[PDB]
């Protein structure tokens, strides 16, 4: 009952503004399907979808605890929820994964590194995963992962993935108060809402009033994010949590989002991967045709547009903006870790994102010493 | 199946999973019940 | 029992039938006779290749 009464949520009670198609508002609703305020003038109210979803279908069944919350709300409310109401200890680790949101397919050899990279990181640790919410792409490559975890050992993975209210399928079905809603793992192919991962542990549901769009959970994770690392981890020597951010493939949007990574204090360390393609090739490519830095010379600057205009199909200026936000990225360079298959790029997953913590934390050995000690991992 | 019919960007026609548990079932493919509950076929929703 | 600690107890027997059956294949891959099965299949395919 207490989280009716702390967390609120929004509907959509606009003009109705047509736009391009009548039916369709600016929250993208019908028409007759109703009941920020810049043109949807929502309301606030307490909230009517929370407690636990049990997944019938796809495999394994696992319940997944969510709650509804609205988009502006402050983070302390949202850490408090996790730690007391679902019981979660404050984590080791945090994992950000960000990447496209268009569904895409890797190398076999690829996926299993990553899977395994990612289930054994988020075992010994005992980190918090960050992912979409939603069952498309690189989230969708999480789920395998850890559909290929549970189905080998047994463990706990907590993998709170954060995703719009209104771009979920089947919304009247997660209607309740501490009530388990089934959920179905079907997904039509006419819809363009895509159903939640049936292999996540809990659910940060964002609505801003608007349904089929993006954009609702964004800042909300990354404030959370930032509120999370905040908090003091239990060594208490005087150090937060550390916080990565894992990128596979991506899109144009990612690179803005690795550069407010980068661009914040204190600094969040970057690992991507290499043979996804899109963002993270283009970064991989920037990378070791790199030199001094920000020091990069015209032929590869002139192989980089066009492999921007090429790959992401983008103008001429469009490339060149990216490439001065490749450039703003790249000023930063020694907080990047890329993962190469092969060769001599740690040959693991969990080598390179530790690692990166390690220096991207940049402080004394005794720290470093206790950061490994609370996740136990005597090895590295 | 698995590698083939089952494979990403697959269209379904509505009912027609249900029809396929029930040929399962009745010529006794244990295995292709597992393909199916593990490609999204909830058994509360077909059982009348 | 009530509803809520039959809901325990349900969840309960659902963390012993996994543990149980995922047991029986770590023992089964442990089993020295599955360890040289798998072994053979492997050294074949590195013969040819």
Redesign the interface.
């Given at each position: 009952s207490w989280i009716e009464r702390a967390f609120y949520k929004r509907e959509c009670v606009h003009i109705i503004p047509s736009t391009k198609d009548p039916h369709r508002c600016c929250c993208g609703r019908l028409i007759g399907q109703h009941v920020w305020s810049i043109s949807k003038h929502t309301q606030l109210s307490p909230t009517d979808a929370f407690g636990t979803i049990e997944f019938?279908?796809?495999?394994h069944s696992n319940k997944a605890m969510y709650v509804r919350v609205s988009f502006d709300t402050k983070p302390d409310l949202l850490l408090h929820l996790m730690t007391k109401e679902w019981q979660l200890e404050l984590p080791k680790l945090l994992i950000s994964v960000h990447g496209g949101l268009q569904?895409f397919?890797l190398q076999p050899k690829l996926k299993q590194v990553f899977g395994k990279g990612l289930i054994k990181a988020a075992m010994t640790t005992g980190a918090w995963i960050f992912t979409g919410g939603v069952n498309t792409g690189v989230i969708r490559h999480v789920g395998d992962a850890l559909k290929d975890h549970a189905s080998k050992s047994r463990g706990k993975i907590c993998t709170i993935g954060i995703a719009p209210w209104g771009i979920v399928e089947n919304q009247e079905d997660l209607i309740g108060r501490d009530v388990v809603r089934?959920y179905?793992?079907?997904?039509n192919?006419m819809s363009k809402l895509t159903v939640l991962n049936s292999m996540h542990s809990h659910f940060i549901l964002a609505d801003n009033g608007t349904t089929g769009k993006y954009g609702a959970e964004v800042k909300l994770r990354r404030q959370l994010e930032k509120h999370i690392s905040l908090q003091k981890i239990n060594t208490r020597i005087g150090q937060g949590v550390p916080v990565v951010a894992l990128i596979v493939e991506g899109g144009p949007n990612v690179i803005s989002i690795v550069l407010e990574y980068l661009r914040d204090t204190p600094p969040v360390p970057v690992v991507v991967c290499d043979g996804s393609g899109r963002a993270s090739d283009i970064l991989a490519f920037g990378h070791k045709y790199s030199e001094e830095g920000g020091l990069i010379n015209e032929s590869l600057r002139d192989q980089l547009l066009v492999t921007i205009q090429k790959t992401f199909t983008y103008t001429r200026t469009q490339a060149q903006h990216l490439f001065i936000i490749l450039m703003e990225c790249m000023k930063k360079k020694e907080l990047i870790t890329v993962f190469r298959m092969g060769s001599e790029g740690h040959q693991d997953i969990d080598l390179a994102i530790l690692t990166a913590l390690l220096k991207g934390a940049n402080a004394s050995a005794p720290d470093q010493l206790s950061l490994a000690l609370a996740w136990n991992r005597v090895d590295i | 199946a698995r590698s083939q019919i089952f494979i990403?960007g697959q269209?379904?026609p509505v009912g027609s999973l249900e029809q396929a548990m029930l040929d399962a079932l009745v010529l006794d493919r244990v295995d292709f019940v597992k393909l199916l509950?593990?490609n999204?076929?909830?058994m509360?929703?077909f059982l009348t | 029992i009530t509803d809520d600690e039959l809901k325990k107890v349900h969840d309960f027997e659902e963390q012993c039938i996994e543990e149980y059956f995922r047991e029986k294949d770590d023992r089964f891959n442990s089993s020295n006779d599955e360890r040289i099965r798998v072994t053979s299949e492997r050294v074949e395919n590195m013969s040819m290749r």
């Open positions: 019938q279908g796809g495999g569904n397919e089934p179905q793992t079907m997904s192919p | 990403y269209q379904w509950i593990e999204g076929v909830s509360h929703r | -």
